[PDB]
Amino acid sequence: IVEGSDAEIGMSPWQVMLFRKSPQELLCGASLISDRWVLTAAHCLLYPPWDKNFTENDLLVRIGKHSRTRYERNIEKISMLEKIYIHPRYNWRENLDRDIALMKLKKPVAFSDYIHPVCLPDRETAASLLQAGYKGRVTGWGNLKETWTGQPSVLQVVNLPIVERPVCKDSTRIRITDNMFCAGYKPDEGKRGDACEGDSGGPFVMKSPFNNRWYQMGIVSWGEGCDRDGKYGFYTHVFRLKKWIQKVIDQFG
Amino acid sequence: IVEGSDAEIGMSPWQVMLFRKSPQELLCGASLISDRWVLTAAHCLLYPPWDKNFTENDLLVRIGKHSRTRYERNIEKISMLEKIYIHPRYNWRENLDRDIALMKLKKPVAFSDYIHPVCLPDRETAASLLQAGYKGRVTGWGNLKETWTANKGQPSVLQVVNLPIVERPVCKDSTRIRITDNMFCAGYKPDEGKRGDACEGDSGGPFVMKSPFNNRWYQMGIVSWGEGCDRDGKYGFYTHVFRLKKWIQKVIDQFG
Amino acid sequence: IVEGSDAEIGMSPWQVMLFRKSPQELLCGASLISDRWVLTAAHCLLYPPWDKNFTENDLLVRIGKHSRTRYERNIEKISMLEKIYIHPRYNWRENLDRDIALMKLKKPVAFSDYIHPVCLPDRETAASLLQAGYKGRVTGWGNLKETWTANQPSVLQVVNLPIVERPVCKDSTRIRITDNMFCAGYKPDEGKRGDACEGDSGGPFVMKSPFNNRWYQMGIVSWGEGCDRDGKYGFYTHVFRLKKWIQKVIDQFG
Amino acid sequence: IVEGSDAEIGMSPWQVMLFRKSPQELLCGASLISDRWVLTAAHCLLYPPWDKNFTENDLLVRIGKHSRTRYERNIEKISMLEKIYIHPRYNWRENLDRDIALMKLKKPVAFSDYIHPVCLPDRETAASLLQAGYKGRVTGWGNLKETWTGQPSVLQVVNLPIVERPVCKDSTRIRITDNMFCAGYKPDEGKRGDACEGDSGGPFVMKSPFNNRWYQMGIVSWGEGCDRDGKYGFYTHVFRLKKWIQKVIDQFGE
Amino acid sequence: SGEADCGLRPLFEKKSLEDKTERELLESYID
Amino acid sequence: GEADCGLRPLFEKKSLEDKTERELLESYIDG
Amino acid sequence: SGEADCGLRPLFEKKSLEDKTERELLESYIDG
Amino acid sequence: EADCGLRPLFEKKSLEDKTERELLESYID
Ligand SMILES: *[C@H]1O[C@H](CO)[C@@H](O[C@@H]2O[C@H](CO)[C@@H](O[C@@H]3O[C@H](CO[C@H]4O[C@H](CO)[C@@H](O)[C@H](O)[C@@H]4O)[C@@H](O)[C@H](O[C@H]4O[C@H](CO)[C@@H](O)[C@H](O)[C@@H]4O)[C@@H]3O)[C@H](O)[C@H]2NC(C)=O)[C@H](O)[C@H]1NC(C)=O
Ligand SMILES: *C[C@@](*)(O)[C@H](CCCNC(N)=[NH2+])NC(=O)[C@@H]1CCCN1C(=O)[C@H](N)Cc1ccccc1
Ligand SMILES: *C[C@@](*)(O)[C@H](CCCNC(N)=[NH2+])NC(=O)[C@@H]1CCCN1C(=O)[C@H](N)Cc1ccccc1
Ligand SMILES: *C[C@@](*)(O)[C@H](CCCNC(N)=[NH2+])NC(=O)[C@@H]1CCCN1C(=O)[C@H](N)Cc1ccccc1
Ligand SMILES: *C[C@@](*)(O)[C@H](CCCNC(N)=[NH2+])NC(=O)[C@@H]1CCCN1C(=O)[C@H](N)Cc1ccccc1
Ligand SMILES: *[C@H]1O[C@H](CO)[C@@H](O[C@@H]2O[C@H](CO)[C@@H](O)[C@H](O)[C@H]2NC(C)=O)[C@H](O)[C@H]1NC(C)=O
Ligand SMILES: *[C@H]1O[C@H](CO)[C@@H](O[C@H]2O[C@H](CO)[C@@H](O)[C@H](O)[C@H]2NC(C)=O)[C@H](O)[C@H]1NC(C)=O
Ligand SMILES: *[C@H]1O[C@H](CO)[C@@H](O[C@H]2O[C@H](CO)[C@@H](O)[C@H](O)[C@H]2NC(C)=O)[C@H](O)[C@H]1NC(C)=O
Ligand code: NA
Ligand code: NA
Ligand code: NA
Ligand code: NA
Structure with missing residues (x-):
């Protein structure tokens, strides 16, 4: 993270x-x-x-x-x-x-x-929570930063907003599909954060403001580098x- | 029917x-x-x-x-x-x-x-029943024979006929209309001798199968379409309910 | 025919x-x-x-x-x-x-x-002409229609028919078919009709090579079940x- | 050999x-x-x-x-x-x-x-020469004897008789097919000889008494050991x- | 509602009676 | 466990909020 | 015996004439 | 080729090799 x-x-x-x-x-x-x-x-x-x-x-x-x-x-x-x-x-x-x-x-x-x-999302949860701008939470013991040459002592956590599909698509040359979604802050938003190598498999969770339960909406899947302006982490679409x-x-x- | x-x-x-x-x-x-x-x-x-x-x-x-x-x-x-x-x-x-x-x-x-x-099929029921050669039952008050009039051979009481599900390759080759996985076809083949089919007026009716596992009737299909009725080498098509x-x-x- | x-x-x-x-x-x-x-x-x-x-x-x-x-x-x-x-x-x-x-x-x-x-096909001719969809020509003085009496045209009859996929030929009959046979005829959804019939057996199923302009006998009328029935096909001895x-x-x- | x-x-x-x-x-x-x-x-x-x-x-x-x-x-x-x-x-x-x-x-x-x-056999040549008892000739630079631990300086040659299929089949547990035949002398026939490892691919030829030409009827294929009583060399059936x-x-x- | 009891006909399965052709379907499920 | 999924013993079950969950809620309000 | 000239009809191919339906066969040899 | 099976140093010059007669004798039942 x-x-x-x-x-x-x-x-x-x-x-x-x-x-x-x-x-x-x-x-x-x-x-x-x-x-x-x-x-x-x-x-x-x-x-x-x-x-x-x-x-x-x-x-x-x-x-x-x-x-x-x-x-x-x-x-x-x-x-x-x-x-x-x-x-x-x-x-x-x-x-x-x-x-x-x-x-x-x-x-x-x-x-x-x-x-x-954790709960798996239902039809309604997915409809109500999977919207651009809505923030989810990612957790893991993966790399603390893009590395090409450290590792966390305690579990790390970061909240990141879901990004519009058109923006996710135009941000990479890799062919994205409906079975994935991306999240992270845009260059102008100022705030930063992303998952990184080692975090895969970790959950992207959201807390329903309707029944107060946590739902796993995504699975850390891939990215290009980590926390790079213009790039966004991709997650497996659980629902x-x-x-x-x-x-x-x-x-x- | x-x-x-x-x-x-x-x-x-x-x-x-x-x-x-x-x-x-x-x-x-x-x-x-x-x-x-x-x-x-x-x-x-x-x-x-x-x-x-x-x-x-x-x-x-x-x-x-x-x-x-x-x-x-x-x-x-x-x-x-x-x-x-x-x-x-x-x-x-x-x-x-x-x-x-x-x-x-x-x-x-x-x-x-x-x-x-009637029951709607679950994953396992569909896997166990939706197989070529397995027969289902179709019911309806539709035409008793292929009719070309805009008006006919209507049944006095509800009609019923049992028909075997057909292999997808055979269904595909029986018509020039593009079929999809959202449909399946049923009916006897020219070399099986027996006859039967749904017909205009029967649409919307159910294609049901009785589970030999729990004794319950499941609606596996909905009469949807065909070309003529009960013609050799032609099969009735049904909406794939599961x-x-x-x-x-x-x-x-x-x-x- | x-x-x-x-x-x-x-x-x-x-x-x-x-x-x-x-x-x-x-x-x-x-x-x-x-x-x-x-x-x-x-x-x-x-x-x-x-x-x-x-x-x-x-x-x-x-x-x-x-x-x-x-x-x-x-x-x-x-x-x-x-x-x-x-x-x-x-x-x-x-x-x-x-x-x-x-x-x-x-x-x-x-x-x-x-x-x-007529010419007999060689391995190359057979490979190039024996394909599903390709039409051949059948000729004979046999029955003009399916007949059930124990015992015909005034002049030789001819009909062109398309070769059919083996899986389709196989599923059209309960008689055991072999690689020494091939079936031909229009499918129910193709509209057109035509078939050989009793009395036509021994007659040739020929095809004209678009490569050397010659006619080759690819089959011999052998059998069927009824004549020109929807979903049924005529079977021919595989000459090559x-x-x-x-x-x-x-x-x-x- | x-x-x-x-x-x-x-x-x-x-x-x-x-x-x-x-x-x-x-x-x-x-x-x-x-x-x-x-x-x-x-x-x-x-x-x-x-x-x-x-x-x-x-x-x-x-x-x-x-x-x-x-x-x-x-x-x-x-x-x-x-x-x-x-x-x-x-x-x-x-x-x-x-x-x-x-x-x-x-x-x-x-x-x-x-x-x-060398010539390849025609229908009649094979019918006339492929008979039990008829001898063919095998050649090669392979092992001079079954070895589990030498090889010739000059090409080796040996004449061996074709053996009846029933005897070939009963001589080994390996399933044989019509695409192969076996040759060699039987236990009490006296004479010996056989192909061996290294001889594979070599020809098994026979001279036609009908046209004086040499024909390759087989290809050294396999065996179990070399020149063992009861065993026979197997050859690919060329025709x-x-x-x-x-x-x-x-x-x-x- | 009306599902837990779905597929069981009052005049047949419910009174242990078989209709005239249902056995035909059963026999078809045996290859 | 399934009917009790997503409810943390040390948080939702004790009526306690973690340090940043509010951030998620605020993001769910279009504005 | 009759082989070198097999399949070429005296009244058609040999006179550069087509019979009434041979074109149908040719067209069937072009897939699509 | 039409010249297959005829050895230049034997059949071609009317010469027999040392053991070919053994094969011939085996072809007589
Ligand atoms: C990495 O992961 C594993 C290995 O780490 C690979 O997957 C296994 O691959 C082997 C072969 O490489 C598979 O075994 C093959 O299974 C076929 C299916 O039969 C199965 O039957 C039951 C299934 O209930 C099992 O008990 C049985 O073991 C078999 O799995 C067989 O048909 C194959 O038989 C033989 O086929 C030919 C013979 O003509 C031989 O050449 C083959 O070597 C083979 O012996 C064979 O037994 C095994 O099933 C796979 N298991 C899994 C987990 O998928 C992956 O391929 C690899 N990942 C990738 C894709 O890169
Ligand atoms: C397995 C996971 O630890 C790891 C997570 C990376 C998360 N990154 C960001 N920015 N949130 N995923 C990977 O390493 C995957 C698996 C294969 C390589 N890979 C990548 O992300 C590459 N960097 C890009 C890629 C290559 C091939 C196919 C898809 C993506
Ligand atoms: C609405 C239903 O009554 C009727 C059922 C026909 C069942 N036939 C057989 N053989 N079991 N269906 C139809 O009439 C449908 C709706 C539109 C036209 N149609 C047809 O079946 C046409 N005959 C074919 C067709 C046309 C357009 C699109 C799909 C199929
Ligand atoms: C001898 C031929 O005149 C005749 C041709 C029939 C061609 N039919 C079609 N549809 N193109 N053949 C036969 O009558 C053969 C010989 C024996 C009976 N027979 C049949 O075709 C039966 N109808 C089917 C049959 C029975 C036994 C074994 C094979 C096929
Ligand atoms: C490749 C050839 O050099 C050799 C010739 C042996 C000839 N033997 C006699 N007695 N005339 N053939 C082989 O070595 C073959 C190939 C694979 C192993 N093999 C054998 O003959 C085994 N000894 C037996 C065998 C094993 C597996 C399958 C078939 C035969
Ligand atoms: C037929 O169904 C309706 C008529 O009831 C058609 O559309 C309705 O009427 C207008 C069309 O301009 C819309 O403003 C309504 O909202 C429609 N009703 C609704 C809610 O369905 C419809 O276009 C026709 N169907 C087709 C595809 O031909
Ligand atoms: C019919 O064809 C011939 C009749 O000429 C049959 O041939 C045999 O007839 C006898 C009965 O077996 C034998 O004793 C003859 O040796 C033999 N005739 C010949 C070949 O010269 C033949 O069996 C019949 N065919 C079948 C099988 O129905
Ligand atoms: C050994 O010979 C070659 C060596 O590679 C093998 O050939 C194949 O190699 C790949 C393995 O499947 C394929 O991708 C190639 O397309 C294929 N090469 C071709 C075109 O022949 C061959 O399979 C091997 N044979 C065996 C049975 O071991
Ligand atoms: Na970024
Ligand atoms: Na039909
Ligand atoms: Na037909
Ligand atoms: Na021996």
């Missing part, structure tokens, strides 16, 4: 960390949507161009964490992955279209004051892919 | 008749999916090429009927339409893609031995 | 009529592929299910004909059969697979403006597929 | 050697069937199980040779490969069915007293695959 700040304790109880067993490495972010299911970005698990193709046994998730590195007793929990489900139409070859994947935990995690699921999410959970619950 | 037979009493309790007030005329079939909602084909309500564009007050529906003509005391019911909802992407200018519409009744209808709703279920659910939830 | 038309004079000079001597009867069509060889369907000569099992001397062929019955002086010719050669794997017991036979004439026939051999056999016979007994 | 002998000069003018450029290696045998085409076994070029998949530029062929490695005056020639054609249905996964491939030379080779093409050979040559000859 670039230009964000330290999260408060329990501020994002649905936050999940995706780790590679060997060699030890924090791969991406993710979110808890039920006691047995975790949502993340498909590329975190599968991206041939970088020779990445993880299997269930190569990874582990950590839930309930605040401080990225330094252990937290009687709070954090770890889980094994029973099965990975990557969208059948995930386009890693071109633009990361449908950059989404679900991970079924081997055993149900217990909810606590630090571990709690548009909800039919798939529900299908997987119902069929393999 | 061509080459079908008389329905048994209460055999299709979800059957609904769509009538035009003036001049009096039976327009199409339709189905009851709840005490307040009726499903039909969009073209029954809107089809500019036939100078058709009905408003809620131009029509009425009759429920619980067996005979096509006579009144059935203490059995049949009539309802007024509160509102018509035609699929926003219904393609009347081309191939009738998304030929579906919903009609909300002004007052809820009471169920009985003759009036009862494929358009997200729309159906959205309408009912938003305007229930 | 159903829904066809009268052929023009000399339009099909390789056309041959196969006749039963006694009792007099036109059995099938056939084609001239050289001055001594005639090609036809094997079932015209051998089909036990119909109690048919002819010997060379039971039949005769007439060549150069236009009218089905009238004599045509200084034009038509008759030939005797020296020997019949039926494909060794002709399946009359099941689906008529390899419905092909050759007949060697006792004496060579002289070509004229009305008598001339069986050309190795044809050449083998002509080479060994020519 | 096991239990064979030194070939006479010019005794097998259609003999061809298939070499790997780097690392330098004599891969297989092959045969000259025209000034531009060479016949060999598919597995010599493609055999995934041993991680073998050669492209045209990885190889070269040597023609007109007698002494494996002692350069021969203005006798031997070298040719580059323009294109490799492996049978599309070559079964390397199971039994080497249709173990055949053609190689087109970049430039035509000039014939001489030491370089001359059965001649339709394919002719198609390739006609389609890509010139």
Whole structure:
């Protein structure tokens, strides 16, 4: 997260960390949507161009964490992955279209004051909240700034506004699709902020002013550099892919 | 319905008749999916090429009927339409893609031995039932034979016929009209011997299948179109209900 | 031939009529592929299910004909059969697979403006012409309409028909089809009609190469179910597929 | 070649050697069937199980040779490969069915007293020569005996009899097909001999007592061990695959 | 409302009676 | 958990606002 | 025997004359 | 070619190789 700040304790109880067993490495972010299911970005698990193709046994998730590195007793929990489900139409070859994947935990995690699921948007929530100018919140332990050569001690958070599709489209040469949306401040707005490498899979959430609940509207997916004037972070459109999410959970619950 | 037979009493309790007030005329079939909602084909309500564009007050529906003509005391019911909802992407200018519409009744209808709703398919039901060779049942008071008159061979009582779903490649090659995944076709092939088909007047009627898993009837399709009726090498086309279920659910939830 | 038309004079000079001597009867069509060889369907000569099992001397062929019955002086010719050669794997017991036979004439026939051999396709010609949608031409003096009596046109009939996709041919019938066959005819949604019919078997399905301007016999009328029915197609013996056999016979007994 | 002998000069003018450029290696045998085409076994070029998949530029062929490695005056020639054609249905996964491939030379080779093409069998030749007991001749620079731990200096030659299919089938657990035949002496016939690793692609020829010409009836394909009692060498059935050979040559000859 | 009880006909499934042709559909679901 | 989703134990469930959630609300008001 | 001149009709191809429907066959060989 | 199978140093000069007769004898049943 670039230009964000330290999260408060329990501020994002649905936050999940995706780790590679060997060699030890924090791969991406993710979110808890039920006691047995975790949502993340498909590329975190599968991206041939970088020779990445993880299997269930190569990874582990950590839930309930605040401080990225330094252990937290009687709070954090770890889980094994029973099965990975990557969208059948995930386009890693071109633009990361449908950059989404679900991970079924081997055993149900217990909810606590630090571990709690986020809501998936319904028809009405998507209609009422997915509008340009409306701000969402992105969280993660990813890079603090565009890097080509550090990493956060505690979870970072940043609020960013959704951007008009025409502006998202004209801001990059990559072919964008309806399965994604972009967010961030425009050059003239003055304020800054963006997700960065390492934050993928993390949630883009919005709090409904109608029922006071938090809804995950996006999944950190990609960008070009981080927090560059003129560029905007792109996120997987969760509501548009909800039919798939529900299908997987119902069929393999 | 061509080459079908008389329905048994209460055999299709979800059957609904769509009538035009003036001049009096039976327009199409339709189905009851709840005490307040009726499903039909969009073209029954809107089809500019036939100078058709009905408003809620131009029509009425009759429920619980067996005979096509006579009144059935203490059995049949009539309802007024509160509102018509035609699929926003219904393609009347081309191939009738998304030929579906919903009609909300002004007052809820009471169920009985003759009036009862049919189920709408869920993901698994559709996967288990929508397969080539599997037969569904079509019902209606439409033409008994291919008719070219603007006026005919109308049935005395509700007709019924069972027909097998056909492979998409076969359906596509049977017509020059562009088909879509929002439709499916059914009927016997020239080399299967048996006959049967829906026909003009039957649109909006349901294509139902009985689940061998839970013993319930599910409406998998809506009579939508064809070219002639019961001709060899030709098949009846139906609106794919499951494929358009997200729309159906959205309408009912938003305007229930 | 159903829904066809009268052929023009000399339009099909390789056309041959196969006749039963006694009792007099036109059995099938056939084609001239050289001055001594005639090609036809094997079932015209051998089909036990119909109690048919002819010997060379039971039949005769007439060549150069236009009218089905009238004599045509200084034009038509008759030939005797020296020997019949039926494909060794002709399946009359099941689906008529390899419905092909050759007949060697006792004496060579002289070509004229009305008598001339058709070409047999080579691998290249077959690849270029045997494609779905491409039309061929069928000719014969067989039934003008589907007929159910146990026992025809005044002049040779002709009809052009498009070759049909194998999957479509396969799904149009419950009879087991093989690669030694191909079907042709218009689909229900194409409007036009036309078909071969009983009595036309052995007749040729020809195509004119747009590459060398020559006519090639790609098929032999073999079978069908009814005649010119919607969703039904005529089936033909695949000549190129069986050309190795044809050449083998002509080479060994020519 | 096991239990064979030194070939006479010019005794097998259609003999061809298939070499790997780097690392330098004599891969297989092959045969000259025209000034531009060479016949060999598919597995010599493609055999995934041993991680073998050669492209045209990885190889070269040597023609007109007698002494494996002692350069021969203005006798031997070298040719580059323009294109490799492996049978599309070559079964390397199971039994080497249709173990055949053609190689087109970049430039035509000039014939001489030491370089001359062998004939491919015709229908009648195959019928007359392909009979159990009839002997054919096999040639090659392969192993002189089954080896699991040497190779000839001059081309080796051995005459072996064709064996009845029933005996070929019962001699091995490997599923055999009509696209192959086996040859060799039976346990009590006394004489011995067989092809061996390195001999693949080499020809199995027979001299027609009808026209005095040598015909290549087979291609050294496989075996289990070399010259073991009870086992027989297997060869690709050339005549059965001649339709394919002719198609390739006609389609890509010139 | 009227869904939890959908697809079960009062004069047939509800009184354990089969209509005259429904078995034809069942037999078609067996390949 | 699903019917209780999106309600944080340490915030919404204790009637406490986090430090920046107000920013999101204000952005939802067109102006 | 009759092969070198096969398929060329004396009253048509040989006289540079077309029969009434052969054009139909040609047109069918052009896809589209 | 029409000249296939005839060896310049043998069939072409009416000469037999040392073992070809073995093949011939095997062709006689
Ligand atoms: C990276 O991710 C994984 C590997 O890290 C790759 O996906 C696997 O790829 C293998 C082959 O590379 C797949 O195995 C193949 O499965 C086919 C389907 O049969 C399945 O049957 C059941 C499914 O219920 C399974 O038990 C069974 O294992 C199979 O998955 C088989 O038909 C294949 O058989 C053989 O085919 C030919 C034989 O002609 C051989 O050449 C092949 O080598 C193969 O052995 C084979 O078994 C496996 O199913 C894949 N699994 C997953 C997770 O998808 C990805 O491809 C790679 N990511 C990318 C796309 O880059
Ligand atoms: C996997 C995630 O950690 C990471 C997040 C980047 C977020 N960036 C901004 N500005 N908010 N995503 C990636 O690294 C993805 C996966 C493959 C490469 N990639 C990129 O974002 C590239 N920088 C651009 C791109 C390349 C190919 C296809 C799509 C996008
Ligand atoms: C409105 C319905 O009564 C009727 C049902 C026909 C069912 N036929 C068979 N064979 N099962 N449908 C129609 O009449 C529709 C509406 C518009 C015209 N139409 C047709 O079926 C035409 N025959 C074909 C057609 C025209 C335009 C667009 C699509 C199809
Ligand atoms: C012998 C030929 O005159 C005749 C041609 C029919 C062509 N029909 C169409 N539609 N183009 N053939 C036959 O009559 C053959 C021989 C045996 C019966 N038969 C049939 O076509 C049957 N109608 C079908 C059949 C039965 C058994 C095996 C194969 C096909
Ligand atoms: C490539 C050729 O040099 C060689 C010739 C062997 C001839 N043997 C006798 N007894 N005349 N062929 C092979 O080595 C082939 C190719 C793959 C392995 N192989 C074998 O013969 C195995 N020994 C047996 C076999 C294994 C798999 C499939 C078929 C045969
Ligand atoms: C037929 O349906 C209506 C008539 O009831 C047509 O449009 C209505 O009338 C005017 C058209 O200019 C609009 O201002 C109304 O809003 C329309 N009514 C509504 C709300 O649907 C309509 O154009 C016709 N349909 C078609 C496509 O021919
Ligand atoms: C019909 O064709 C001939 C009749 O001439 C049959 O040929 C055989 O007839 C006898 C019955 O089997 C045999 O004893 C003869 O040897 C043989 N005739 C010949 C070939 O000279 C033939 O079987 C019949 N065809 C079928 C199968 O119906
Ligand atoms: C080995 O030979 C070549 C070596 O690459 C292989 O050829 C293919 O290589 C790629 C793998 O599928 C394809 O992208 C190429 O199009 C294809 N090359 C062509 C045009 O032939 C070949 O598949 C390999 N053979 C085997 C069975 O291992
Ligand atoms: Na920016
Ligand atoms: Na029909
Ligand atoms: Na037809
Ligand atoms: Na041996």
